[PDB]
Ligand binder design. Structure first.
Ligand code: PNB
Lengths: 219, 226
């Protein structure tokens, strides 16, 4: 029971700027004792949730003076004055005034950082894999910002071939870059017919520089 | 030092049952309530139940009444939660925590401590061990200053796999990318950037362990001899 509604769904903040997550509730959260049981949780990438503010405005031991708990009636607000890289996470609000304690849907914070070019690394299929009749050429693109980057696979001087699969990581809450791994998986046949394989990376737009490549046979 | 340790990744066939565990240490077990949470996709963060080990008194969120059951073992300081008649809807990550709330009257909050979590996958599909492939560079040399190595854990089910380098004795610089479900089968990879000082000479081993299939694979990343 009780519906907690959070907004925005996600939000980008340039380190140094403030942010305001909102949490509206479906009922009043004031208890007989005149207490309002509303807490704010964090949960950084790869960790469990952690309590930040209890009783609407009470900072927990360790929480920075930059966080501010507030609200009244059914409207609640968490304010961050100066956003630091370490505040990356998915903030949640929990009402404890009515038995079935309920949470908000979380608001994902994204640290807006200055542009940064990646470090490409391409790897030829392992001989071990080739004996099973498949071939996955891997290219690791890491330590970059913004997120969405364009990776191009040019087999034997031409376009793509035999479908690519991509995967990014969470922003580093220490620095604020990303990392992606692009895997080109061809069958043994197709691999054994072409010899030059390249991995280009277009920083958002333009003609793709930042190229790494190897040559089959001559390896 | 307060520590809450949870059970490992469970893979269960529908309709059956599992029992998770939360082992406490560092604090006085029976003097605090232990809460259990569900973090599912879509659904997302639901409060399940709580237990006071001292008196053995429980409280259940109406929505999970008859699905979950809590208990505690005083001697071992371990709390358990049991999930009956599992369904696809039950697959998620469950947490246990020493929330720290007292009573409406004390209105005091002891520092919360959370367990790491337990991935529970309700499925009928057969388990499939991963295929580890050691990926080494070549040509006119690759990664000049720092060299990046890699490991490709291909075609397994279900998640998770636990990739590590030199058994944890190589922690700084590792990158692990999310597994992406392709043909009802996962694939993930990881990189490790080590200076060139220890690449040619000095061993590097990618160790992947697949809990759901009691499997362990050690791949010594070797250079190219051609
Ligand atoms: O139980 C009731 O009937 C009376 N109301 C209360 O006791 C208020 C409880 C305050 P609080 O400790 O915030 O309880 C809600 C609450 C409990 C656990 C949690 N969690 O993340 O584990 C998040 C929220």
């Amino acid at each position: 029971d009780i519906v907690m509604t959070q907004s925005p769904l996600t939000l980008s903040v340039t380190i140094g700027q403030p942010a305001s997550i909102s949490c509206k509730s479906s009922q009043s959260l004031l208890y007989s004792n005149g207490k309002t049981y509303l807490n704010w949780l964090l949960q950084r990438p790869g960790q469990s949730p952690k309590r930040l503010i209890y009783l609407v405005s009470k900072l927990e031991s360790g929480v920075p003076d930059r966080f501010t708990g507030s609200g009244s009636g059914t409207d609640f607000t968490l304010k961050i004055s100066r956003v630091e890289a370490a505040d990356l996470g998915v903030y949640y609000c929990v009402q404890g005034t009515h038995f079935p304690y309920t949470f908000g849907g979380g608001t994902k914070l994204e640290i807006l950082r200055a542009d940064a070019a990646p470090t490409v690394s391409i790897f030829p299929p392992s001989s071990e894999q080739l004996t099973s009749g498949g071939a996955s050429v891997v290219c690791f693109l890491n330590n970059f910002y913004p997120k969405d980057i364009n990776v191009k696979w040019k087999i034997d001087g031409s376009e793509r071939q035999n479908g690519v699969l991509n995967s990014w990581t969470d922003q580093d809450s220490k620095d604020s870059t990303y990392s992606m791994s692009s895997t080109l998986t061809l069958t043994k046949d197709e691999y054994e017919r072409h010899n030059s394989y390249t991995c280009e990376a277009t920083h958002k737009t333009s003609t793709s520089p930042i190229v790494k490549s190897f040559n089959r046979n001559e390896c | 030092a307060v520590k809450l340790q949870q059970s490992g990744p469970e893979l269960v066939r529908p309709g059956t049952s599992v029992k998770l565990s939360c082992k406490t240490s560092g604090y006085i077990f029976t003097s605090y309530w232990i809460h259990w949470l569900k973090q599912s996709s879509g659904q997302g963060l639901e409060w399940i139940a709580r237990i006071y080990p001292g008196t053995g008194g429980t409280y259940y969120n109406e929505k999970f009444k008859g699905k979950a059951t809590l208990t505690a073992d005083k001697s071992s300081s371990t709390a358990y939660m049991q999930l009956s008649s599992l369904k696809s809807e039950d697959s998620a990550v469950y947490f246990c925590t020493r929330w720290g709330f007292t009573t409406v009257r004390e209105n005091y909050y002891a520092m919360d401590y959370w367990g790491q979590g337990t991935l529970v996958t309700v499925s009928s599909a057969k388990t499939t061990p991963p295929s580890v492939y050691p990926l080494a560079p070549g040509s006119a040399a690759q990664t000049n200053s720092m060299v990046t190595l890699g490991c490709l854990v291909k075609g397994y089910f279900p998640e998770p796999v636990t990739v590590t380098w030199n058994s944890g004795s190589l922690s700084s610089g590792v990158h692990t990318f999310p597994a992406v479900l392709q043909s009802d089968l996962y694939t993930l990879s990881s990189s490790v950037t080590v200076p060139s000082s220890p690449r040619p000479s000095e061993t590097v081993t990618c160790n992947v362990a697949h809990p759901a299939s009691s499997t362990k694979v050690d791949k010594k990343i070797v250079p190219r001899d051609c």
